[PDB]
């Protein structure tokens, strides 16, 4: 049971693999390579919402891969030092760009100097007297480093969402993921779609547009119900191609 | 007139700077750094739709930066060789991961071996006898390289969209960009919004959700009109915070 | 205090007045037609009137809806009347004896399956008391259930209506515009200023947004211009912030909105 | 061929029949009430009937709407009649001479500002010919414009209605259900199977989706159950693919849909 995910050890992907469903781990260098692998009858963990995905949504649409589960990662950044450098000894920090913005206020509270690095790995490289790396919690410790502080990010409940993927359309599910594709351009296509679910009061937890026409990624809090089959009928009558790409709990 | 954008010379950002509004160029290492700079009373070019942006949408929301123009880049990949290696001499190619997926069929038509590289710069490094780099057209030539072929991507009209940004809320505009933020959670908030514009038949060219609540990025094909002021009134009555973040032609 | 309604005695209006009011807290004042009823309420400051508003079986509610639109009169309550009928005869006859019935037109129309099942011959009369005067051996009157006993007659048969849940809704009306004020249903007049496609949907979509039920929706033509309409709507809500929201939205959409009623 | 309508001669129905038909392609058959009209059309296979459907000023359209719902009768066309009135007198009198008018109730209600401006005293009569019989020195009849000249009288004054664009819409009805077939407006009966909030909006929202205008929307109560309704809708469209789409959607939403009319 090969579990393909974005590596190396210590990424968000790996953290969510581990911290959630604690199973032979197979790290991949980026996501194209993890989707390919999954699409051998194996498993994959891979982000969809707000990561630090075109590719993912896209393979989901190709029917190369299907979503059987969800995992929501508590985004969290730590500060890693050289071993009892105390926080007040940190002169300078090193982190990738998206993480500097996640933690820009922390940098400021403390008036750290800072600059950028291609990797969290490279962040760890820079650690020395008066130098700390901002990286995800649970991640510096893969390579023997101990946080100076933790929950470092400016905003309190930032979350990334991860899908469990397979090459198996094998979906008692109580959340459903749909690709809804317009067969022609007209005004208000997204509106059509949202309104059809809202007829039936089917709450949509997540919705996404992707290509100047767009197709639609929607996720609904509800089981396979007769109401769901109705909105499907209506959408098809409205000219939407409808394929279910996820079903889970 | 410092023009801040994502570098180095030969990125999509730079290409759109150049090919569109052909002006003192100031390349930046990534986008956080270009938004900061813009937010000195200067200019910025920066992508919003489908790039190969959390950060961008986010600064637009902070009112740190405002959009005064649009540029749509014809995505396009070329094949760069060592100088009359003909296409049939290419054994292997090197490119970043998102570009391999853009061109996966081209790789296959020709049965190239392939692997990944951190950069287009690094792609160019690998060029030798029997080795070619897949990179954006107009980009290998910044560093003296000539395409083996061009329009290499699998799908024909992929496009990225770029905003012209400023630290100036100084908006005769005929496209309008709004941040619409819900003051509370209830079902169908996005629906509310789309339906209000559709009352007035105001076509929305682009719409985006971002944070488990969401705020909304919408762009409307219409001027500052009395109808637009109406939908604004309605949205405020519905409890949406409304700020205009873009206005252009 | 005056209670105007459509007479003569034994109409459905009259019955609604009996069901819903004491004779010893109102003086009953029958009028000849609905125009007169509304006119009397309009001019008598210590009056109410009871007037059909939904599912009349005789005569149009438009005249009532127009009085309300022009604010000649105001709605201060509603009452629902079951529309049921009986067969009234000579005290002797059984149903097997009846050869012929006489009835007002509205009553025939509601009891036609009845009339047919029984193969009665029939003819029309101008009023229920008229009906009653045709009674003799083998002749019956079809009348509002309980109207024959207002004149000293007895049914041969009752509950003879063809449908069981036919209900006419009446308004209790007054010439004063000041309403109960823990009101739990609201009536609005809503008038578009310009012609636009989908005006009614607009209105209904707005109330749905705040999940507020409409128990009644009526339209009437402007009459001052071809093609234009106004809307009558009754909402199950007290006057709340949600309600002020829909009015604001409707006004932004260029409808004028006015409360024409409020009660329980 | 029979043309049933509400009499006697000189009603608005009668006038609509004159405006819209030859006497020499129909035999005119007045009936006493709308129930009789609909009943005659229902039983006469070579018949039409002309019957009010929108903006009646006298008497309810519900009976017509119910006949249509039960498919006793079918709509094969519509005609619009201007509702206008004249003052009819003794050939001698001028308006300055008139002390008193007599009129049917519906006519008083539409000419009341008129009556008031001129300070006529008035009273009611049961029909326009009755009106006409009250005429003498200082006494006039208010009647449908062109109905006095059906009996040999002349107006003292015309176009005396208080509003200029009051229009009653009539249906041309038949007991056969087979329609014109380059039809450009469609009438549907649409009935929900279950009670749900926002049923009417559902229907209207569905037609809007395909940008199809509704020129008329009416509701009627089920009557077999409390609380339930059916919907009458007239759509400006021929029978197209868009139309088949809305019906499919409506049926998916658990309405039954049936064509009750189709014409131009
Ligand atoms: Na009953
Ligand atoms: Na007129």
mmCIF file of N, CA and C in Angstrom, chain A residues 94-132:
data_model
loop_
_atom_site.group_PDB
_atom_site.id
_atom_site.type_symbol
_atom_site.label_atom_id
_atom_site.label_comp_id
_atom_site.label_asym_id
_atom_site.label_seq_id
_atom_site.Cartn_x
_atom_site.Cartn_y
_atom_site.Cartn_z
ATOM 1 N N UNK A 94 15.433 33.043 8.123
ATOM 2 C CA UNK A 94 15.512 32.618 6.751
ATOM 3 C C UNK A 94 14.367 31.654 6.508
ATOM 4 N N UNK A 95 13.634 31.873 5.422
ATOM 5 C CA UNK A 95 12.428 31.110 5.096
ATOM 6 C C UNK A 95 12.054 31.377 3.634
ATOM 7 N N UNK A 96 11.185 30.541 3.054
ATOM 8 C CA UNK A 96 10.687 30.799 1.689
ATOM 9 C C UNK A 96 9.684 31.977 1.712
ATOM 10 N N UNK A 97 9.408 32.554 0.539
ATOM 11 C CA UNK A 97 8.660 33.815 0.464
ATOM 12 C C UNK A 97 7.218 33.764 1.016
ATOM 13 N N UNK A 98 6.479 32.682 0.697
ATOM 14 C CA UNK A 98 5.076 32.602 1.125
ATOM 15 C C UNK A 98 4.928 32.495 2.660
ATOM 16 N N UNK A 99 5.970 31.975 3.306
ATOM 17 C CA UNK A 99 6.000 31.780 4.751
ATOM 18 C C UNK A 99 6.415 33.063 5.498
ATOM 19 N N UNK A 100 7.104 33.961 4.793
ATOM 20 C CA UNK A 100 7.576 35.220 5.355
ATOM 21 C C UNK A 100 6.338 36.085 5.482
ATOM 22 N N UNK A 101 5.440 35.951 4.510
ATOM 23 C CA UNK A 101 4.192 36.709 4.483
ATOM 24 C C UNK A 101 3.183 36.167 5.473
ATOM 25 N N UNK A 102 3.233 34.862 5.727
ATOM 26 C CA UNK A 102 2.385 34.223 6.725
ATOM 27 C C UNK A 102 2.744 34.721 8.110
ATOM 28 N N UNK A 103 4.027 35.034 8.287
ATOM 29 C CA UNK A 103 4.617 35.393 9.571
ATOM 30 C C UNK A 103 5.228 36.817 9.613
ATOM 31 N N UNK A 104 4.831 37.682 8.693
ATOM 32 C CA UNK A 104 5.448 38.998 8.614
ATOM 33 C C UNK A 104 5.350 39.800 9.930
ATOM 34 N N UNK A 105 4.265 39.626 10.695
ATOM 35 C CA UNK A 105 4.104 40.364 11.965
ATOM 36 C C UNK A 105 5.037 39.856 13.056
ATOM 37 N N UNK A 106 5.207 38.534 13.110
ATOM 38 C CA UNK A 106 6.175 37.895 13.990
ATOM 39 C C UNK A 106 7.596 38.418 13.743
ATOM 40 N N UNK A 107 7.996 38.479 12.471
ATOM 41 C CA UNK A 107 9.232 39.145 12.063
ATOM 42 C C UNK A 107 9.334 40.597 12.628
ATOM 43 N N UNK A 108 8.199 41.285 12.658
ATOM 44 C CA UNK A 108 8.179 42.697 13.027
ATOM 45 C C UNK A 108 8.136 42.908 14.538
ATOM 46 N N UNK A 109 7.285 42.155 15.243
ATOM 47 C CA UNK A 109 7.225 42.209 16.713
ATOM 48 C C UNK A 109 8.640 42.192 17.244
ATOM 49 N N UNK A 110 9.462 41.341 16.620
ATOM 50 C CA UNK A 110 10.800 41.013 17.099
ATOM 51 C C UNK A 110 11.914 41.755 16.335
ATOM 52 N N UNK A 111 11.559 42.466 15.257
ATOM 53 C CA UNK A 111 12.543 43.235 14.465
ATOM 54 C C UNK A 111 13.716 42.354 14.031
ATOM 55 N N UNK A 112 13.372 41.193 13.470
ATOM 56 C CA UNK A 112 14.338 40.334 12.818
ATOM 57 C C UNK A 112 14.685 40.903 11.451
ATOM 58 N N UNK A 113 15.965 40.807 11.093
ATOM 59 C CA UNK A 113 16.372 40.859 9.694
ATOM 60 C C UNK A 113 15.908 39.537 9.076
ATOM 61 N N UNK A 114 15.737 39.514 7.759
ATOM 62 C CA UNK A 114 15.208 38.347 7.078
ATOM 63 C C UNK A 114 15.611 38.336 5.603
ATOM 64 N N UNK A 115 15.842 37.147 5.053
ATOM 65 C CA UNK A 115 15.758 36.974 3.595
ATOM 66 C C UNK A 115 15.419 35.553 3.167
ATOM 67 N N UNK A 116 15.403 35.352 1.846
ATOM 68 C CA UNK A 116 14.682 34.250 1.227
ATOM 69 C C UNK A 116 15.582 33.146 0.805
ATOM 70 N N UNK A 117 14.936 32.012 0.645
ATOM 71 C CA UNK A 117 15.593 30.779 0.471
ATOM 72 C C UNK A 117 14.632 29.968 -0.401
ATOM 73 N N UNK A 118 15.203 29.123 -1.252
ATOM 74 C CA UNK A 118 14.415 28.320 -2.184
ATOM 75 C C UNK A 118 13.576 27.263 -1.491
ATOM 76 N N UNK A 119 13.984 26.882 -0.275
ATOM 77 C CA UNK A 119 13.487 25.672 0.375
ATOM 78 C C UNK A 119 13.376 25.796 1.895
ATOM 79 N N UNK A 120 12.576 24.944 2.530
ATOM 80 C CA UNK A 120 12.695 24.826 3.995
ATOM 81 C C UNK A 120 14.005 24.116 4.342
ATOM 82 N N UNK A 121 14.375 23.144 3.521
ATOM 83 C CA UNK A 121 15.662 22.489 3.663
ATOM 84 C C UNK A 121 16.819 23.495 3.774
ATOM 85 N N UNK A 122 16.925 24.377 2.762
ATOM 86 C CA UNK A 122 17.850 25.505 2.759
ATOM 87 C C UNK A 122 17.730 26.480 3.973
ATOM 88 N N UNK A 123 16.508 26.825 4.383
ATOM 89 C CA UNK A 123 16.285 27.454 5.687
ATOM 90 C C UNK A 123 17.086 26.767 6.793
ATOM 91 N N UNK A 124 16.961 25.451 6.907
ATOM 92 C CA UNK A 124 17.643 24.773 8.010
ATOM 93 C C UNK A 124 19.177 24.955 7.895
ATOM 94 N N UNK A 125 19.673 24.972 6.658
ATOM 95 C CA UNK A 125 21.105 25.152 6.340
ATOM 96 C C UNK A 125 21.696 26.414 6.919
ATOM 97 N N UNK A 126 20.882 27.453 6.959
ATOM 98 C CA UNK A 126 21.326 28.759 7.384
ATOM 99 C C UNK A 126 21.407 28.879 8.912
ATOM 100 N N UNK A 127 20.776 27.950 9.644
ATOM 101 C CA UNK A 127 20.815 27.998 11.102
ATOM 102 C C UNK A 127 22.251 28.117 11.625
ATOM 103 N N UNK A 128 22.517 29.162 12.408
ATOM 104 C CA UNK A 128 23.773 29.292 13.194
ATOM 105 C C UNK A 128 23.523 30.248 14.342
ATOM 106 N N UNK A 129 24.576 30.584 15.086
ATOM 107 C CA UNK A 129 24.437 31.598 16.129
ATOM 108 C C UNK A 129 23.748 32.850 15.541
ATOM 109 N N UNK A 130 22.653 33.258 16.182
ATOM 110 C CA UNK A 130 21.885 34.458 15.803
ATOM 111 C C UNK A 130 21.027 34.319 14.552
ATOM 112 N N UNK A 131 20.936 33.104 14.002
ATOM 113 C CA UNK A 131 20.166 32.810 12.787
ATOM 114 C C UNK A 131 19.155 31.680 13.034
ATOM 115 N N UNK A 132 17.899 31.940 12.677
ATOM 116 C CA UNK A 132 16.779 30.980 12.823
ATOM 117 C C UNK A 132 16.016 30.796 11.499
#
